[PDB]
Write a protein that binds this ligand. Structure first.
Ligand SMILES: Cc1cccc(C)c1-n1c(=O)c2cc(C(=O)C3=C(O)CCCC3=O)ccc2n(C)c1=O
Ligand SMILES: Cc1cccc(C)c1-n1c(=O)c2cc(C(=O)C3=C(O)CCCC3=O)ccc2n(C)c1=O
Ligand SMILES: [Co+2]
Ligand SMILES: [Co+2]
Lengths: 364, 363
């Protein structure tokens, strides 16, 4: 059942912004670890004396890393009008490396902002004109994470990012096959008030529910190409550990999709030792006898063999299979981690959520 | 002239520690950018809930990256007893990614501390025993940068780093040939008072002085294997550092390799995908000058490779310096790196062989 109850036209994921201690360090390591070359910048070298922002890109995946300058800063040169230097300094201290903004492209950032706050959204940054048709607004998502709306005409899709961001070419830099954001998951202490608030102001509909040490709900836009789950603890748990160390609600993981995840993972795992991302240790060997039974009709024996070699997990639902693997936490604290995935099947384009989210795997 | 006036036995550089709000990002990028595999850690996984510390090593070169935990942090579990979460949070807000500690191995950290403050050093952390014979002490160097003394018996050497740190094996991880710290440079608004204070409490002796716009003074220990220069601006690149850093601090660290061109080939191969960028190569007429000045030391092939990589060549009395500088290593136009090789002065190699690049201010 899809009621298509979006209160505003929600087109797709646009970017994720991490407010960093040092944007050069975080973007540099993520570039190497993910195979996502630098694609745009706004900083002192482009006339922005308020914040340093670096935009990494792989396929349609856009990661924005932003840090505040401390001295000589003219707040009027910020390419992101919502930026506040003291808020970013506090944010990095409160959390370590952490997602500040989940950004969706909407038909009209002002219309989405107005509809959101009328339906209970706590305003974060009222809509502004970024220039030549670009609009931006923010509302509170959970904790100190904001849901950012950006809008611009389709004819502007050739531009690097947002006004004020200069493009950066990547001639001698190829990617590792990461193609798109699939889902972004938040942890909250109480799912029911947080889901009621968030689904309430967006009109996003329940896509999936898993109850089980967590209770989870997946919220989706009309087309279900925007997937934004929320988790709560039950009652020591993985969700509570996050909340304690993080200091509040926050983004727990971002799932990044590839059309060939085994090839992507071989490249990422070659980088782990020297400063890329380490991955969770592979399951016991009997896990993959299970994979042969549950998915041996759609995965070849060789593919399952590669899955075992690289440690990837396999789950399946009705007519779809999910390959997934998780990184260890990507900052200092046991909080944020990444999920790298491939979805197989549900070609009806591919229907969102094909293969589910890995519920079958929590018996590791 | 070397008066060998050290107030305490100063053995060698031991490590440099950067304070950060995010150690994992900085140590991650430095690891593949410089080719320094992770070699030790102290954090939640080792029983330390106060700070997360990552130790990168390449040869004798050791970089420590430390960030405070924010919630449920028990300061009493810190592996670094001088660590203070409140001071580290202030440090990151004030400076961004920046050097906090320049650490020297001394014969006895307690004696080095006592003799220093007796000679005017502003104390920063009184000497403490870390166990297994390790002692640690800190005095103020300039601004918020401390000079850290560490001492331990030579039968300890095989310990990963300091007590409380757990080794990281990094299975088949390879370095890019960086082998040791050559010198570490601080910027200050006024050279004469800063040097009077610093040379005063250490007994380090003046090794060289230069005028560019900057005035500089190199201080050295007795053996001259520890080189700690200071710059002031001329009333500028130095003032831009002070403005954006918020005060005095470490401007650059020079990292030596026994084969800098091979090292730089590996570092520059990492630039496009998140490694460090380097200052652009000088124009071809500069390298005609290198041929005139250094054709008795470098081959034509080396000079052509220097040009390809952008490395600068300078020379003093019977020594040659090969050096190249990175762009700033973080967001702010503050800290940067110098990658070098020294050629000649084999009498081991005499410290400071070939100078610091005073010639290279014309290119
Ligand atoms: C990575 C890790 C570290 C330490 C402890 C644990 C449980 C895990 N961990 C996961 O966090 C995990 C998450 C999902 C999944 O991504 C999904 C949530 O289950 C709720 C719905 C939406 C979201 O997409 C699936 C499988 C998982 N598995 C199997 C796993 O082991
Ligand atoms: C890298 C960069 C960026 C923007 C502006 C400039 C001047 C530079 N820059 C340097 O900072 C630089 C520093 C030294 C040198 O390392 C040395 C100082 O000259 C004083 C003595 C101790 C110290 O070790 C030598 C050559 C240099 N050159 C050639 C150079 O261009
Ligand atoms: Co997931
Ligand atoms: Co130098």
């Amino acid at each position: 059942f899809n009621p298509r109850s979006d209160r505003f036209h929600t087109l797709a994921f646009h970017h994720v912004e991490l407010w960093c201690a040092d944007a050069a360090s975080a973007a540099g390591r993520f570039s190497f670890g993910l195979g996502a070359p630098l694609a745009a910048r706004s900083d002192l070298s482009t006339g922005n004396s308020a914040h340093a922002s670096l935009l990494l890109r792989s396929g349609s995946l856009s990661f924005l890393f932003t840090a505040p300058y401390a001295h000589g800063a003219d707040a009027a040169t910020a390419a992101l009008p919502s930026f506040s230097a003291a808020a970013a300094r506090r944010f990095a201290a409160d959390h370590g490396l952490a997602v500040r903004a989940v950004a969706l492209r909407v038909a009209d950032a002002e219309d989405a902002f107005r509809a959101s706050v009328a339906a209970g959204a706590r305003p974060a940054f009222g809509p502004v004109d970024l220039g030549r048709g670009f609009r931006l607004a923010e509302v509170e998502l959970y904790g100190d994470v904001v849901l950012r709306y950006v809008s611009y005409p389709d004819g502007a899709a050739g531009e690097p990012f947002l006004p004020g961001f200069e493009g950066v070419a990547s001639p001698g830099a190829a990617d590792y096959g990461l193609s798109r954001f699939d889902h972004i998951v938040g942890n909250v202490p109480e799912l029911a008030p947080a889901a009621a608030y968030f689904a309430g102001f967006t009109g996003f509909h329940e896509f999936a529910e898993f109850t089980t040490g967590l209770n989870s709900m997946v919220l989706a836009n009309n087309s279900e190409n925007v997937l934004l789950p929320l988790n709560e603890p039950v009652h020591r748990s993985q969700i509570q550990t996050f909340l304690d160390h993080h200091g509040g609600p926050g983004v727990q993981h971002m799932a990044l999709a590839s059309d060939d995840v085994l090839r992507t993972l071989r490249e990422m795992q070659a980088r782990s030792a020297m400063g890329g991302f380490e991955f969770m240790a592979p399951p016991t060997s009997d896990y993959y006898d299970g994979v042969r039974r549950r998915a041996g009709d759609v995965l070849t024996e060789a593919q399952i063999k590669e899955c075992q070699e690289l440690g990837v997990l396999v789950d399946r639902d009705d007519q779809g299979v999910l390959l997934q693997i998780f990184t260890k936490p990507v900052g200092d604290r046991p909080t944020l981690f990444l999920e790298i995935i491939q979805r197989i099947g549900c070609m009806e384009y591919q229907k969102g959520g094909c293969g589910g989210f890995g519920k079958g795997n929590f018996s590791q």
